[PDB]
Amino acid sequence: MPVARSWVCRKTYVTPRRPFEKSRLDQELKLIGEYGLRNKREVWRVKFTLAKIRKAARELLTLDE
């Protein structure tokens, strides 16, 4: 049981709630085609990082200057 290993890891993306939404589908395909990406996981990744940056910014923005 005791071992010199590390188990720290995380996911880097999140799937969308509405699975079949024509607008989301075609907007993410426009974005895949114009930047020559392989997957949509590669769009959900960037969406995740942008969402976390926004969360941190809004969190800092509610404190008093």
Partner 1 sequence: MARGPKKHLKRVAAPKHWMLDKLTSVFAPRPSTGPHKLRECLPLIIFLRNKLKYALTGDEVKKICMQRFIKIDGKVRADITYPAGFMDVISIDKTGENFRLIYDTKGRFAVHRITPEEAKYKLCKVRKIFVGTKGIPHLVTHDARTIRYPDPLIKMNDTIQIDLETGKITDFIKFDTGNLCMVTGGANLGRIGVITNRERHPGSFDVVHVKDANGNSFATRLSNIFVIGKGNKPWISLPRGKGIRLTIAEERDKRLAAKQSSG
Binding residues (CB under 7 A) for RNA: these are 1-3, 5-12, 15-19, 24, 51, 56
**Helices H / strands E in the chain, number of each:** 2, 0
**C-alpha torsion sign, points 41, 43, 47, 49:** positive
| C-beta of 6 vs 15, nearer to partner 1 | 6
- Please select the residue that binds partner 1; options are 4, 9, 61, 63, rule is CB under 8 A: 4
Q: Which of 26, 49, 29, 50 is nearest to 39 (CA)?
A: 29
The CA distance from 17 to 9, in Å, is 24
Binding residues with partner 1: total (CB under 8 A): 4
Using CB under 8 A as the binding rule, the residues of this chain from 6 to 35 that contact partner 1 are 6
**Smallest gap from residue 53 Cβ to RNA (A):** 9
